[PDB]
Amino acid sequence: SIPFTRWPEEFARRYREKGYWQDLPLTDILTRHAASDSIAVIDGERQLSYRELNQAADNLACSLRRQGIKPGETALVQLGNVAELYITFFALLKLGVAPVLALFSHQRSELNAYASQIEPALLIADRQHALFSGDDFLNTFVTEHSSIRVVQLLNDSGEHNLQDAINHPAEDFTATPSPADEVAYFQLSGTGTPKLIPRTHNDYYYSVRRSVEICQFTQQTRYLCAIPAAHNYAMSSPGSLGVFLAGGTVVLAADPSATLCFPLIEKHQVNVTALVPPAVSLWLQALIEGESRAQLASLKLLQVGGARLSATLAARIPAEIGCQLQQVFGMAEGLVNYTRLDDSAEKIIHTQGYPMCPDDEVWVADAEGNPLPQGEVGRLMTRGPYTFRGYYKSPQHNASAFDANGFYCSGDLISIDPEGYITVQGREKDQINRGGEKIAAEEIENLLLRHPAVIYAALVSMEDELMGEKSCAYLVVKEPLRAVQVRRFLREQGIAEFKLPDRVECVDSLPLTAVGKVDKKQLRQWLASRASAGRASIPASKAALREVILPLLDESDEPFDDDNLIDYGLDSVRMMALAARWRKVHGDIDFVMLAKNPTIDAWWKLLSREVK
Amino acid sequence: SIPFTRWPEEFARRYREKGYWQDLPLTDILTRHAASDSIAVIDGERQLSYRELNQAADNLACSLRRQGIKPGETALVQLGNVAELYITFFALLKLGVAPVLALFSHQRSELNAYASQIEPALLIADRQHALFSGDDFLNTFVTEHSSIRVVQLLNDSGEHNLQDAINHPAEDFTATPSPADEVAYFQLSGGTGTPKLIPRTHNDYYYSVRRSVEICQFTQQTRYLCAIPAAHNYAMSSPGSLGVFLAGGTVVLAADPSATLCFPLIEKHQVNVTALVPPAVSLWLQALIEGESRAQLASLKLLQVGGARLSATLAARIPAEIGCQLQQVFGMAEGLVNYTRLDDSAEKIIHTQGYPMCPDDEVWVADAEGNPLPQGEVGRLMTRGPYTFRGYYKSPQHNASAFDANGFYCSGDLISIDPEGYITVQGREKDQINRGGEKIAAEEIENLLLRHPAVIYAALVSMEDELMGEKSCAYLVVKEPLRAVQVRRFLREQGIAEFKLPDRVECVDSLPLTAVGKVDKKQLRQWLASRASAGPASKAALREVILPLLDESDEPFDDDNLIDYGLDSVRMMALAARWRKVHGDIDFVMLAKNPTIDAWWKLLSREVK
User: Could you say which residues bind substrate here (chain A)?
Assistant: First the structure.
């Protein structure tokens, strides 16, 4: 068996006796439809029956078994939004092989990290991925991961051609899924080392079943998959696995641009899709800028999740797109909260839903680690029938990631409604949520420190209108580095392109801890007092004052030194702010003083005085 | 009797029975504390006890009676955050004269407008007001409003000296307040092209004060800092200074809600409650973050925020950065005031604007056709109740369009109601700017504009401002071109409140006109988003477009990978959607395969095929 942290016996029995764990493999999602001719997968021009989908999975599993792949073993897969992802996935389940489905965005350091951990016998990737265009990386990778005995490549026309395996008809094949209470596959986690989440058939099949129920997926569902298909969101909430379980149709898209997706939604009459907020921002702008909503008329449900949706953006969706919103707050660790189809337009705009299972136990903790009453803000704790009880082979990290009662901390600050619902309030874990992709501050900092000129490094999130958050790397350096240089360096480290720092700030020093690392939990306050210290400098010339004043007033006109600044749109609150700062030098300056004579002349007269 | 719209008989009767209307005059707020030596008012270095407050009020009313003022008559007052405002107010209730309390920032246009309506016997004002420094304005105003027989001036050393009157001891004086079911005074609307007046009776208005005190638990230990405009209904009655007076506490007055004035005042006097508008919260928060000690605000236990929308982000910061409970206050001078409760969860307080203060505040949510909506749906605020007016003063035409058949008023706000009944404002329907809590009517500002010779069409709309909440933008089509400073100056020459001068002015070629002469605003919003929607010529022009999207730091070569300069994929996807309308073969994929200025220029510069 593959090592994972089991639920304690009383919980396993409880979950089994309640019917959350049904003891069926995940392969059951497909094989129940193994004779259906209705369409399961649409990928560009290609369409697969359910019966085609199952046959192909059977075929691939058989081909892999003929090449010496065995049950209990492990696989590394890098396939993006293509039909083969699902064929591969069920093929491995049928074979009883446990896959890690890497992001198509993942590069050499991610692929090495996953491979090192699972010791994979099987590697399936895609010659359309830049690492796999030629054969040089593949040669090194297999050499450096000697467990790898078989390699199958999409878009290849040689001995490793994945299409061959998939097209070769099974011959006396019996599926051998791993037991339902054992690992089915490894999910990815959002620390400086990639952490894997073992999922069992029981916990994961439950998370999908219950999602199908809540979202009412049916044979009639036509679901657009345009975010990354391998992510838990797109795979299971209810995602494409939900669609398959319901006997519906999955429509695949390379990316969630409006350009690509709008005509697909019309062509195939998508009624449900899952987006991340930047993509939502994108679709709204496209319509306002001319795109026809009529293309999206068939659309019945837009899922938004992965990141914090503003009430304002949340609210434009029925109004502008023309369909229901569902907020979905979820995590690969387990817990998924949905709003409901029968929720009020009120509940749907402001809250992130409540847990999909009634045995999902969630409780807001404080820093001491105490339950707070309903309505108070703090740490999210949780265990349940589909929340794991331990990262793959990480006992030290698990000792720190769970409480005494086996509750897992999600690193999310939340408040619970009177009525059960959850509204996300903040985060305490150290990560950037860049448009839905998670970045470990720890990981990026170690790579930055690898550069000769970098001595100290800190990665923090900054707000961005489209992306939600972005990365900011502060650096203390031996020699000045351009941001383009830092991004170039990290590219060379073979890391995913979204992990490239969005801004770089070189600085002369940074708050340090004891071990010689950067003190982040003051870098909060340290940063604030640097920005507010340049803004505390009282101008030393009339010119320097003009420089502070102009950006506060109207862009259109530029005033004369003796002009009434209010006639150029200087508002009284900004005036009050200036007063509060200048009073720190001349302590007789207040709002009333400035407002009596609101000109640069008169303010320079005051400002240029000697401190008395 | 001063003309106003009575509540129906069944309503009046019900309101008395349930205890809402008590049939006490507003003066009872003071006279119930007339032997109390406890401090009622602190204005700079001056302190007035309750018995003094009452005494001064009696003195003023007595003098005004000596100079010929009679109950039933009306009064125009412009006094800002001074102790005299309360002394005056209570003197006028005692005499039974009904004031309009103007804003200290109100100028010549607003003052002529209120006077025009109330036909005032009495004018009181402040020589510290630029209109009243000398006697030029005062001389015209009195002449242009002949009803005025008596003028009294704060900061004056002549016969019109307000302090002479306040200091002259009362003789043979007994109060003659107007009957409790009649107008006590006129409150100002948000606003229409004409300033509207809200007649408040001693019954409905006292009730809003009493019930507000119960909710915010004001008592004799309450020490309320009044630093926003004291005459406004918020600072005056929600529970405001009248609440403080009712509960026997202390009002501490300030001229403005800046931190540097206010922080010291809260420490020195151990102020425990205060009422802010959102910009002033942003203001106090920044001063602290930039060095002001929070120890100065230790005594502070409650902070009211209202008048405009408070964001949840800002709301969440208050208990954490100021160290006192937050209370959201959604009120209108028409009546309805909702409050969050002291025993609310932090969740409730942050996200909601509270529920109504009165059990018989009937609030429902109407769709645009006028039909009720299920709890939790979004729409128009309809409301009536025992302290919500039934009509503006002498405005039968407007009142017909302002109330529905059953006497529900329409606040012009967009709201949703959560299960528990809490209210969250979702938007606004009426045509006004909410500029840090001061209400600007677009209509009013537009007629003034159209009076400028170069101006042929005008539209005032609101725009977001991180600090003020909303600012004002004036779109004009004009004969000869106008600078913003010219427009603001011209408006000043019209004598309007400074806050009503347009924050922005964009001159434009044309404007969507209403089919009946004016400018179409509910088409202007979408006219606007489709005028700026239009907006690459050369490689140079492409470059002009790309750079602001990428990293501000470095500058790229034409063959550089723009992702190495931090151009994210969503901005890239958006660029594609835009460029597809010319070259119908461009998608995100095409742009991303080769993200350079050179490659993109090559594609853009192709002939359309």
Answer: 232, 237, 306, 328, 332, 412, 429, 438
